[PDB]
Structures are given as structure tokens and as C-alpha cells.
Amino acid sequence: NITAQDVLDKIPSLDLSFPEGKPNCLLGLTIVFTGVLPTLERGASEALAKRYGARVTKSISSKTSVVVLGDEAGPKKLEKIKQLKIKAIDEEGFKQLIAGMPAEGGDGEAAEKARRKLEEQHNIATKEAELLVKKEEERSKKLAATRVSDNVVREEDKLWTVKYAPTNLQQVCGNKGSVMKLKNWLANWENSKKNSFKHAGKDGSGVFRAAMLYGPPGIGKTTAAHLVAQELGYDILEQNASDVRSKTLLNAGVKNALDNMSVVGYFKHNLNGKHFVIIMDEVDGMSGGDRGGVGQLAQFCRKTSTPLILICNERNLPKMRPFDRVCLDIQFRRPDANSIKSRLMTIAIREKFKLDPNVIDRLIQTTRGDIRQVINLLSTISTTTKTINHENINEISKAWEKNIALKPFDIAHKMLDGQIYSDIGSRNFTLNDKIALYFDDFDFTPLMIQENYLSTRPSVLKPGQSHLEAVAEAANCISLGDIVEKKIRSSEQLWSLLPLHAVLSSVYPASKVAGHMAGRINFTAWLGQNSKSAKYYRLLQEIHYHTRLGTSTDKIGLRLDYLPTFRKRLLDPFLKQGADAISSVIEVMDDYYLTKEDWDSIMEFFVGPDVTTAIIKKIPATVKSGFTRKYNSMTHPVAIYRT
Amino acid sequence: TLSLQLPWVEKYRPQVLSDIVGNKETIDRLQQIAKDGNMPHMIISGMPGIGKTTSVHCLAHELLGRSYADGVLELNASDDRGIDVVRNQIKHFAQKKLHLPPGKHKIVILDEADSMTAGAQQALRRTMELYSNSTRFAFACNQSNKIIEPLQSRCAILRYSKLSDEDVLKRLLQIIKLEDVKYTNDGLEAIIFTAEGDMRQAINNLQSTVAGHGLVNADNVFKIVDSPHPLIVKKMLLASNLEDSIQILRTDLWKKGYSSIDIVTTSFRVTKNLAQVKESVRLEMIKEIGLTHMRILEGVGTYLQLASMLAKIHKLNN
DNA sequence: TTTCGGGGGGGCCGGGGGG
DNA sequence: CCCCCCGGCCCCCCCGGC
DNA sequence: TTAGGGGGGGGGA
DNA sequence: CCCCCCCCCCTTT
Ligand SMILES: Nc1ncnc2c1ncn2[C@@H]1O[C@H](COP(=O)(O)OP(=O)(O)OP(O)(O)=S)[C@@H](O)[C@H]1O
Ligand SMILES: Nc1ncnc2c1ncn2[C@@H]1O[C@H](COP(=O)(O)OP(=O)(O)OP(O)(O)=S)[C@@H](O)[C@H]1O
Ligand SMILES: [Mg+2]
Ligand SMILES: [Mg+2]
DSSP, X not given: OXXXXXXXXXXXXXXXXXXXXXXXTTTTOBEEEESBXXXXXXXXHHHHHHHTTOBOOSSOOTXXXXXXXXXXOOHHHHHHHHHHTOOBBOHHHHHHHHHSOTTSSSXXXXXXXXXXXXXXXXHHHHHHHHHHHHHHHHHHHHHHHHHHOXXXXXXGGSOHHHHTOOSSSTTOOSOHHHHHHHHHHHHTHHHHHHTTTOSOOSSXXXXXXXXXXXXXXXXXXXXXXXXXXXXXXXXXXEEOTTSOOOHHHHHHTGGGGTTOOOHHHHHTOOTTTTSXXXXXXXXXXXXXXXXXXXXXXXXXXXXXXXXXXXEESOSSSGGGGGGSSSSEEEEOOOOOHHHXXXXXXXXXXXXXXXXXXXXXXXXXXXXXXXXXXXXXXXXXXXXXXXXXXXXXXXXXXXXXXXOOOOOXXXXXXXHTBSGGGSHHHHHHSOHHHHHHHHHHTTTTHHHHXXXXXXXXXXXXXXXXXXXXXXXXXXXXXXXXXHHHHHHHTSTTOOGGGHHHHHIIIIIHHHHHSOEEESSOOOOOOHXXXXXXXXXXXXXXXXXXXXXXXXXXXXXXXXXXXXXXXXXXXXXXXXXXXXXXXXXXXXXXXXXXTOOXXXXXXXXXXXXXXXXXXXXXXXXXXXXXXXXXXXXXXXXXXXXXXXX | OOOOOXXXXXXXXXXXXXXXXXXXXXXXXXXXXXXXXOOOOEEEXXXXXXXXXXXXXXXXXXXXXXXXXXXXXXXXXTSOOSHHHIIIIIHHHHHOOOOOOTXXXXXXXXXXXXXXXXXXXXXHHHHHHHTTTTEEEEEEESOGGGSOHHHHHHSEEEXXXXXXXXXXXXXXXXXXXXXXXXXXXXXXXXXXXXXXXXXXXXXXXHHHHHHHHSSBOHXXXXXXXXXXXXXXXXXXXXXXXXXXXXXXXXXXXXXXXXOHHHHHHHHXXXXXXXXXXXXXXXXXXXXXXXXXXXXHHHTOOOHHHHHHHHHHHHHHHO
């Protein structure tokens, strides 16, 4: 009949309040939205596009059927649009497209493929519902037979998450690769034990005695662990945050279970039924540097004689450092909408409330990939509203929005975005919002801002103001913020000044240089430099108090004045006289109570053209060996006598 | 006199879901849940004095009836709620055997849950997961962000909105009719304006005004309820001439006994929430206010410093 | 990173009581 | 005379704005 | 408007 | 089948 291409040809083309179209009119069209629309906002335009079953990609590629070009379009977007030769339309263009493609079908193979995929999803949902009702009928028949000739819990009284929890591995949606990897690792654990965990297979999982599953909340980590443990015929010994897992309890608790037979396995007699699978769930839930037992669990991971699976939500936390390279790491990513659309449709039809498949993705966006949260949202909403569609999708999504604290990189990216500092953008993301964004991680926000405020192309420059001037203003404000921070952490503990520190350290300098990140966002380098400075100051103090009885100065004077002459009288002789100057160097060292470690540290202090790394390396190894032998073959004096 | 009159906030505390005003959709959802049961884990968040504890208690009562005493475990910030409590008392309550109708469950009400420690919240996770067949949890808090993400994932989110002046007026009229309180429209308007959507504050102010003066009119209401100083600070910051701002500072704030620290903190907050002013100007005003706040915290809390702050703000605005 | 102060949780030590 | 229960220090870890 | 770069996984000439 | 689309996730004490 009519193909979307001919409609687009009819629609006016662009070169470098809305009509109610028929259902799924934009089906099979990949609409990429860019710029600013006159009447519709980005969110409103995306919602309108989804209302008609149109894929809304966040980027532009060869599959971008159409493009919605508005005011203030991204330069990269225009560059890629011209490179890929993709048509663009205006607000009236989109209006005519929705009102000029009513057949909702009959277009090219893309529309037919989309319809076939939708029918396949519906059929899968119906088949799953049929299986569920068959299971319910079987359970009811067994219950009636038992009753005819203990109180059980009826399914109607159970939470939807429990009622629809996966029963086997296949029912787990998303993270198929991770699930398969875990299954393979656990299946061949006995073979790895036979090889003493020395040989590594194709996947390299044969050298780990423990596995660590990590991912965001409500994605199926515990479910997958339990399912894999049950499938391979193991006995599960599970621990969680509800149990005491301190170092003492760990030593007196599960430690004895590492190499112990299971009595239940013996009395329930698979060949692996007598062996334990120790599941430590919510591993990040234990607090304590040493008494918590995180380090103790890491040590256990290195000698466990039975499979050990750890589960945590935050793998990069400092508390998790002991688990660096001792367990096989398995990441569970946020599942995509498609992998769970069939499950959501099955739940919707079984619970006898209507759910529009075109809004499911939005619900996922509300929950940030939290399947448990999605099921809870459906259960709570369906109690009063039996139909879910575009009529009330916006309100439901806004009400249940998951306000997750941003990470330092995301905080830096958002705070340095120039849009939020414009007249229009400031009314949506207010100053209070920016202060809250700082308070998300007050400890790291000022450091990230100071690190990344010189690596942006600004878009908020005032007329006649250069990038350098704004940078200087931001630096001045950052210095004032540092003064305020010093005030906060003094003996007076003026924590009430924290909000002001938010403005001076992050919000104001960011507003001065807000724009587009000219390059990759970098983590703050100040902490590593501070640690290096502390180490070097400790070394300098050690050297100074070794030579105190001979010199007349403070440690700073020793670094600035004495060290060059000491270099001239310690390093130059080796380079000039070869190995014949070892005696003079040793004599100078003895005169000042210096040791070999002191010699190396002194050589490590110099900068600029006096760096000694290359010079030290170029020295023949024989000279260094002779120097070490001569130093070790004699007695030396001691400056500080420890007792 | 050794006798006390019961506060009207307690005497007229709603006992059923139908007596709660505001947040109509959430109240209807709670009513439906009470009718049908199968209450899920829930987190109720919102501003102070809007009827969160009232809603939770009413829902529990309608759900459990005669079994309320046995089937409800209530814990708040005044009770012990450490990790040991979660691991022993709450676990014992969850595992407790209690025969209930075919659509009811035991309820744990953790009021002011935002004050609970991270360890207790973490320990609650598997307790909620394992015993959901017989026990359900209802958290009530002011800031939902303090609740860890795993607990939020396990609960249904109910964000309470501020009460509109219409609902406050409706409840106040019911209370007045039940108490036979002589009033005037202007007095009720003043009470509503001073309440700022706080039903508890409005009821307390009404009761205090009736006790202290009898007739509820603007004069008596304002005598009992002082005009909020944030509005005075906003007027001071928005004054066109430095002389007017200094006049307001000296007459409405300094001579009334307001401390300099309170004045400067309120100025900071009001400037932060001043949408009518350009954001960059607000940032400059905040810089000046922070300088003054640091000076006051150091110990120089004088009227001269506040006057200098106002002068600098006006210079910036010019 | 961290200059007080508060809160919480876990580990021993030791007084008292019981057998 | 010896073992166990249970109160109190001692230490160590973690916020600190709204 | 997408900071750069790497990993996972559905679609397909 | 390699290539592409598309998204998510890591940089990080
Ligand atoms: N991939 C999934 N597929 C189907 N349902 C899921 C999935 N993930 C989570 N759920 C549902 O949410 C419920 C809880 O899943 P969990 O296995 O506990 O996720 P989780 O990652 O372990 O959450 P945390 O880490 O304890 S907060 C399941 O019983 C399911 O009903
Ligand atoms: N929606 C309401 N309808 C009627 N009275 C209310 C309402 N909200 C509050 N009140 C009255 O104010 C009193 C206290 O209400 P609460 O439920 O305790 O408010 P709250 O939000 O729980 O306070 P916080 O958050 O713990 S400070 C009630 O006993 C009622 O008398
Ligand atoms: Mg879990
Ligand atoms: Mg309350």
C-alpha cells in the first residue's frame, strides 16, 4: 500500500498540538532526536515517538531512518549526519510523518520484521502463561488429593517477586554469558582440584578456588548462584548480612566447613552431594577494616577445599581490595528491556491487567534495570489502575524514579555541563540541585572539579571574556574554597560551613568554565601526589636525623643546600674514577652515618637536569656489586641508638 | 493546676484511612490494599507533619483488627534498633508462628527509618527476603535517600506530597466544628499561611490561639504565631535601596532578638532559593554571605558585620 | 588525607554467683 | 576450689549539610 | 549534547 | 562469518 520511504519523500526534506495518528504508525522507524524542538521537549518528543512504537536511538548510524533536527544541534551530530547521508525533518515534518504514515504496516522489510518480533514476544508470553497455569493446576490437584486423604501458603498471599521467581537457569533474563561462565566454572571445579588449580583452561577459570559475582541491585545474582548450586547437585551453606561474620566467628564458623563433609549430603544419598558450596552473600554488607573479616574471607578464598561463591554490589570499594586477584570475577550487567519484555507480558496477562509493551522500556528506565523494583511497581500500581499505557506512563515513571547518588565521574560530567547554567537550564536544574549534586560525594567533588576544570571548551563565556580569564577566576574561587575547607576540618569542626564549601569549591568555578568536555574526564591526581610527598618527606626526615650530628640545618635546608654537594661527593666519583672511588664514598658515608638505603633515597630526591635514574642505570653492574660488597664487608657507626 | 488537656493533634488523630487528607491517590491505594490484603514492603517518604505515621498505623489497624497487638512490631528512633536488635528481635518476630486470616501478614513498622545505621539496614535484607511469606515491612522517613538501595529495591515507593491549603482548611473546619471554636476567615487564613502545609503545626497553633485568646482572628493568631523570619530575610535581600534593607535588618530582625548566626544562615538559604534572581548574581551574594558567616563563626557577631554584608550585596546588585 | 565529638559494634578482662 | 554468666572498660570504624 | 575507550550481545550481507 | 548497531560500564583513593 504505502511505504515509509514514499511518505518521507512526500515530507519536505532538510539539507545541511499534534495529530493523533493510528496505532504504531511509526513502527519500524529509527528516529534519532537532536537539537531543540519548538513545541516539544526532548522528553516529550521521545515519549511521543515511543507512543507510536518507534525506536529512539541515542546516536546516529546507518540505520537511522529519520532524524529530528531542532535548534542548537550538536556539532558532532551534524558532522555524522552529513557523513552518513541521513535525512532530517522539522517539527512540521514530524507532525506530517505521524499523520502521514497511518497504515502502521506494509512498509519495507523493517516493519514486517518488527511485527514478527512483536508476535513472537506475545506468543512466548502466552506459552509461559500456559506453563504457569498448568503448574498451578497440577499443584491444586496434588493439594486436593492430599487434603481428601500443616497449613500451606496460597499463591495469592505471596509477593509477585516470589511468585514469579525463576525456577531454573533458563528463566533468568539477561547476563547469559556470566551465567554460563559461572556454570562452567562450577562444573569443572573437581577437575581443577584434581590438577591442584595449576593448569588454566580455555576460559582461564581453572586457577581460581572462589568466584565473585558482582552487579547492581535486583538483577538476579543470588537467584543465579542458588540455581547453579542446585543444578550441579551440591549442598548449599549460605551466609548473609543477617549473620555474624566477624573474624572470630568466621574462624570458629565456616572455617571448619571448608574441608568438611556435609551430613545432610550423606543422609540424602549425585557424586557431589557430599560436598559444600559456600555462598557468602552481601559480602559488601560487613563493616570493619580488620575485625569485619573481609581480609579473613580473602585468605579463606586461597585455600578453600570446596567451591566458594561471593556476592557483592560494589566491587570497586576499598573494603574489597583483598579480593583483587584471588577469585574469578563475574559481572552481572543491567538487563536490557528486550530480555525481560516476555516476562513482563507474561506477568501482566497472568495477573489480568493490561500493560502496553511500548512503555516497558520506560519502566526499566525508572528502575535503572532493577527487575525486582519493576515487579514491585507493577504489583503496587495494578492494585488500583488495571491499564498501563502512555496515558499515565509519565506520572508513574516520575513517582517511582530511583534517585541514586551519582559517582564522582558522573558528578564531574554533569557539573561541567554548560546546559544547566543557561537561563532555561538553570530553572530546571536549580542551584539547590547543584548543591545536592555536590553533597552526593562532598569528599571527592571538589577534587574532581579542580582536576577537570581546565579541560573543557566553555559555552558560558561573557562577551569579551577569554577562556584564560574564566579559568583564572575559577582558580581563585577554588583557592578560597580550599581555605574554607581548612576552616571546616580545624579544631572547631565547623561542619555547618559545608554548604558554602559546595559553592566555592565546585559550583562557582564550574559555572565559570561550564561547557563541553574537551577530552576524557580524569580522576583527581592530588591523592597520589600527596602520598608520594608524604613518603619523600618521611625519607628526608630519616636522612636528616641520620646526619644530624654532623650537619647544621633543618630538613628543608638539607634538601635545598646539602643534597647537591652530597650528590657531587657521592655519585660523581663513580662516574669519573670508576670503581676506584668506592673508598671515598664509603668514608663520606661513615662520616655522616649514612647507609645504603640512605644513599638510594638521596639519589631519588633530585629533579630537573639532576635526575639520577638514567645515570645510575648506566653505571656498570660490576661497580655497583663491588660497592655493595665493600659496604657489607666492614663495620659502620650508628647515629641513633635504639633501645 | 496539675491537670492537662489532651492536645488536639492526638485527640483528632485520624483512626481510619478515610480521615486522612491530601495525597488522594496514595490513600486510595492503601484503602484498596487494606480491603484486599497482600500488603507489600513499602517506604513512605515526605515532609514533616503530613500524615505518614498516621497512614501507616491506620493501614496496620485496618489490616489486622483484633490481631493488631500480636501481629505488629513497632520500632522508632526512641527504641534500640542496632544490628543486634535486627538480628535477634526482628528475626524472632518474623519467624514467629501466628495464625491469621487468608490475606493478612505480620507487620514491622520502622518509623523514622532514615536514622537507622547501615549495618542494620544491610542485615534487614535477607530477613525481608526469606520471611516475606508471613511478614511485611513498612518504613516511614523524611529522606528516602538515607535508605540504602537494596532496601529500596525490595519496597514499594510512596512519596507523600505537601498538603494544599484546601485540605488544611478542610481539616481545620472539621476540628472547629467538633470543638465549637469561634473564628473568622482572616484568622483561618493566617493560620494556614503560617503553617506552610504542616497540619500538626496548624492544629497546634489553632489550639494555642484558642487557649490564649479564645477568638481565632488575625491579631490573636499572629500574637501566638510569629511571622516566619525567612520571609523578613527575603524582603530584606530584595529591597531596592540600602537604607530600606538596613531598616528591615535593624527593626524586624535585630531589635526582635534574632541572633546574627540565625540571620546569616537564613539569608544563605533564602538566597539559594531565590529563583527570581539570576543564578550568577545569587552566587556572588552567596560568596558575600559566606564571608560574613565565617566572620560571625569566628566570634565577631555584630550588627556592623550584617550591615556590611547588606552593603556588599546591594553593591553587587547595582 | 584529615586537625573534635558522638555513635555504634566487637573484643577481651574481671567480679560475682553457682556447683 | 573451679567454671560459667554477664556487666563494664578498651579499642577501632565511621558521619559530620538539608 | 553524548568525555574516551572497552565489553556484550542481537542482527545479518 | 567479521562487521555493525546499540547500549552499558570502567576510568577512580
Ligand atoms: N534476571 C531476572 N529475571 C527475572 N527476575 C529477576 C531477575 N532478577 C531479579 N529478578 C526478580 O527479583 C527478584 C530478586 O532477584 P535477586 O536474585 O535477589 O537479585 P539480586 O541481584 O541478588 O538483588 P540484591 O544484590 O540482593 S539487592 C527475583 O526473585 C526475581 O523475581
Ligand atoms: N493528612 C492529615 N490529616 C489529618 N491530620 C493530620 C494529617 N497529617 C498530620 N495530621 C495531624 O498531625 C498529627 C501528626 O501527624 P503525623 O502522622 O505524625 O505526621 P508525620 O509526617 O508522621 O510527622 P514526622 O515526619 O514524624 S515529623 C496527626 O495526629 C494528625 O492529628
Ligand atoms: Mg541478593
Ligand atoms: Mg512521624
